Design a protein around this ligand. Sequence first.
Ligand SMILES: Cc1cc2nc3c(=O)[nH]c(=O)nc-3n(C[C@H](O)[C@H](O)[C@H](O)COP(=O)(O)OP(=O)(O)OC[C@H]3O[C@@H](n4cnc5c(N)ncnc54)[C@H](O)[C@@H]3O)c2cc1C
Ligand SMILES: Cc1cc2nc3c(=O)[nH]c(=O)nc-3n(C[C@H](O)[C@H](O)[C@H](O)COP(=O)(O)OP(=O)(O)OC[C@H]3O[C@@H](n4cnc5c(N)ncnc54)[C@H](O)[C@@H]3O)c2cc1C
Ligand SMILES: COc1ccc(NS(=O)(=O)c2cc(NC(=O)c3ccc([N+](=O)[O-])s3)ccc2OC)cc1
Ligand SMILES: COc1ccc(NS(=O)(=O)c2cc(NC(=O)c3ccc([N+](=O)[O-])s3)ccc2OC)cc1
Lengths: 489, 490
Amino acid sequence: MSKAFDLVVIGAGSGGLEAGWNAATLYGKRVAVVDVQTSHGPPFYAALGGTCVNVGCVPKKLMVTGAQYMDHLRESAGFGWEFDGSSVKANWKKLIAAKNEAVLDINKSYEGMFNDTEGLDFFLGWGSLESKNVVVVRETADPKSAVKERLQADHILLATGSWPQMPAIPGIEHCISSNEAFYLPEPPRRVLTVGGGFISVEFAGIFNAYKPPGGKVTLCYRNNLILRGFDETIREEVTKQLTANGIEIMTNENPAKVSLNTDGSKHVTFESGKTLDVDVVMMAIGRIPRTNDLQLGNVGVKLTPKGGVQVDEFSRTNVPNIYAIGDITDRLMLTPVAINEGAALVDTVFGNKPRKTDHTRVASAVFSIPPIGTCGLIEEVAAKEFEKVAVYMSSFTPLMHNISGSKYKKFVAKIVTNHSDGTVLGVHLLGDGAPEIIQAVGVCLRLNAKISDFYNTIGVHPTSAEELCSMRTPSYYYVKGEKMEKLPD
Amino acid sequence: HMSKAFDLVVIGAGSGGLEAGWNAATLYGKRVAVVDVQTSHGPPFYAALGGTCVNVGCVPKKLMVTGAQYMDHLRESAGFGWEFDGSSVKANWKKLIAAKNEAVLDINKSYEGMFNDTEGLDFFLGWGSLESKNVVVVRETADPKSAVKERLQADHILLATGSWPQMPAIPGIEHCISSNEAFYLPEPPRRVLTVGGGFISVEFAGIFNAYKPPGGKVTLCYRNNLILRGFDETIREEVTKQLTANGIEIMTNENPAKVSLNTDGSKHVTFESGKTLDVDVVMMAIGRIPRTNDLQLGNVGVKLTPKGGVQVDEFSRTNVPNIYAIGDITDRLMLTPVAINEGAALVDTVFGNKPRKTDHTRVASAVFSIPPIGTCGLIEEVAAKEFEKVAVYMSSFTPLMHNISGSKYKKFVAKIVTNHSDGTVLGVHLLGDGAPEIIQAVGVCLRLNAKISDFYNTIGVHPTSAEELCSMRTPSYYYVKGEKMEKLPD
Ligand SMILES: Cc1cc2nc3c(=O)[nH]c(=O)nc-3n(C[C@H](O)[C@H](O)[C@H](O)COP(=O)(O)OP(=O)(O)OC[C@H]3O[C@@H](n4cnc5c(N)ncnc54)[C@H](O)[C@@H]3O)c2cc1C
Ligand SMILES: Cc1cc2nc3c(=O)[nH]c(=O)nc-3n(C[C@H](O)[C@H](O)[C@H](O)COP(=O)(O)OP(=O)(O)OC[C@H]3O[C@@H](n4cnc5c(N)ncnc54)[C@H](O)[C@@H]3O)c2cc1C
Ligand SMILES: COc1ccc(NS(=O)(=O)c2cc(NC(=O)c3ccc([N+](=O)[O-])s3)ccc2OC)cc1
Ligand SMILES: COc1ccc(NS(=O)(=O)c2cc(NC(=O)c3ccc([N+](=O)[O-])s3)ccc2OC)cc1
């Protein structure tokens, strides 16, 4: 049993490492951090640096960047670029290779951060909860496996992230998740992405760009319109723009069973009885908090009906000295949120300056082609919470997208306001640059910006962003939940 | 030989003129005359219905800088495993200009349509000048002794004739061009000199650099030590390195003295230093001068500034009561969205009796250099003079993608200048892909008197270059009563 660690962190993720690093370097505390690999990839995929670094945001972005060149190569003809169209080949093996040494470089720098940091000490293997003051690192997820060491802990931080949700259906063994998608040896000629969420749409675009000749990408979603939770205009518009770039959307369709065909390909039967033959089925239907391997049964840490570690506003479990941040808490499954929770916790605990994460008006993005950037309430959620809601809406084709021959690439800008004071509740953007435009909109909503603060700021011309400063008249309203073009006199 | 009286007569169908005219007409139901010298872009007068921005400014340059970005995209795509015949790549300048001219022409025609479809908003081809304090005469040419097309009776008059390229009086200036002629070159120049350290010189340097024929070269000269005077100094130094890196030669402390034609029609250039250079095109972009000469302001006695701009107060008023000036002719901030805001403020002042004035501080602006610039508010040097203690937050990083791409030089820079007393953000300066789009909403933050703490307490979007603005909590260095230092004195 090790000497007294001030903090023990199970999960070297976006949250864990912020908490660890802040606890150690900032408040001079003695810290232990525990993950299952020191580098990305099979068998466990996530590793030192967390889901983001190894099998999330970082490698994804690189791969969506890769996929954009399909569009750039085609669009450049309008601007009078000329090359041998038959000679164009998308080399998936070189992408993955580059993506792996990029991620691998991050892995090794974290290792160096641990090596160079006093009182911040890394431990390979599977952490679980023995007692309220003891974390046991075993060799595997199996609790009956060899004990690598027991860590004595003043306080304990659960930060094991989340994991792909696979539906219990016949042939689920033949289907994959984002995790495996990151390491496919060759790019799939045909692929089914299952889900209407961000991971399905993003991978649909990546496969769509790198697919060998006569390839095809289908995406299915059990309900009527993809990207539930996002602005409805944008949901309908990013459907049309994925379709336009050669992706088939099957809505109101869900796999019932997958079976292997005699060539090793995958035959898929939808609950509708429809069938489809594809080389890969990627499940991205949700992500579940990663609680199973922690043996929270031992110390009686309460999970929510959902399955996440229940916490209050300060990341505290029902066991006083034990805490949970990140995707394990099953709230906003973002990297910057897990990092904010991490820092607020460590300042709460070791700074006795109790700070909590604001989970409202958080800026987020979907690296679809074309991409999304959003911050705050959709109009539907606003319409229920506020008596009178104004919606400002503007759609336009960036002038370049005339010439480029991608005329479908409409840019959409929506501002949702509390019409009583013109306070901006939400800002929803679809088109090139959206993820970059929305960051500073995040700070505007933090300052309780009103619609008049947007339209009285002078535009930067020519940009898509200036559309946000060009909308003075509501397009329509929601009065006590009910839609209309005008307010009633 | 006179008209029925107009509420407003607008000389210049520009960004500013059309906003004023359109707002006056459709909003306050006024009767409006607008005067410009062409109905479409191009020679002979280049600017036209829609103004400099539409015809020979922001709109066509953006389309062209977009075009030049494919040189980079084609090369960078190799790192993400794209493969094609590198020898087969040709940049076709004729198709760029052609597509650009189709796009600008479609704007020209829709303004014509706007005038056709709008009651009490009437367009008039030709050269407007000031006859009396209540009369604008439209002549057939800039020559005041030319045929009169009509006299417009005017309650109020709006001067909005924009600006025009400054050419230095040197021998061989006749052999040199401006941005105006650059927009119509029949072929792309193998060798070109851009003269000027400002935004037009840099932007065109990048365009010529992407579309130059084989063995071609782009040189940019600037009479002083460091290009882009007025911009953040770190960014000035960093965009010098990034233009160099992409194969553009910067000659600083160098200015043309004379140009002469060589026997093959090429252009032989002598610098004040005695240095010489042979290039196919010399593009002068050394400044832009308010367009006042053709208005005959001598007639009604409208006061120009020492600079040469129409002098105005905060409400766009000349010294002649019912005569106003907005836009580049007022020789202040020479941006389209600023002429548009002045235009709207003037019309609401005049025909709404709700006196409004443009805020010329904390205006967001951009440079569509490769890579680009987005800035809003004070540079640390101007801040250091105005404020007793100034903090500077600074971050430089290579977007991860620019390891893999092989464009490792493409450093992204972020600088926040604060009033250290209250942490009030005075200015935000950005270099790298997306900067012109990041800075827009920063504009609104500065409008709301954001503090550095409002930035670093906003949760980043990941992964983006924009989240670096929310990742800077410690000042890098300070300016105490003008003097620089790493730390504050105890
Ligand atoms: C495909 C994909 C794309 C994404 N894109 C984005 C994006 O663009 N932007 C964004 O903000 N977020 C994105 N995310 C989500 C983001 O990565 C997560 O929100 C974040 O990684 C969760 O942080 P965390 O600290 O909760 O846990 P993680 O960072 O997930 O850390 C968990 C770590 O703990 C380890 N671990 C697990 N169990 C144990 C155990 N029993 N003992 C010890 N260690 C254990 C894991 O191996 C892992 O290394 C994406 C996720 C996915 C799957
Ligand atoms: C190459 C270039 C790039 C630029 N890029 C940008 C940019 O990216 N962003 C930005 O914000 N700004 C940019 N600008 C500046 C922007 O173009 C101007 O600030 C804007 O056009 C000014 O509007 P205005 O109404 O004052 O004048 P203009 O828009 O210039 O309109 C004046 C009009 O008056 C006409 N005219 C002149 N004399 C007469 C006369 N006697 N009678 C009748 N008509 C007359 C002209 O034909 C012209 O159409 C750029 C300028 C140039 C030259
Ligand atoms: C100078 O040439 C123009 C002439 C007229 C106009 N007027 S307008 O088209 O009606 C208009 C446009 C915008 N925003 C866009 O122009 C862009 C976004 C992204 C772009 N870009 O391509 O990146 S351009 C905002 C408000 C607005 O008025 C309601 C604009 C420009
Ligand atoms: C999960 O992957 C991470 C790896 C390392 C870190 N930590 S860090 O390197 O110290 C760091 C990075 C950034 N911004 C960027 O990394 C980018 C912007 C645009 C990019 N781009 O490539 O799209 S990357 C901002 C602040 C900061 O620390 C204060 C974070 C996340």
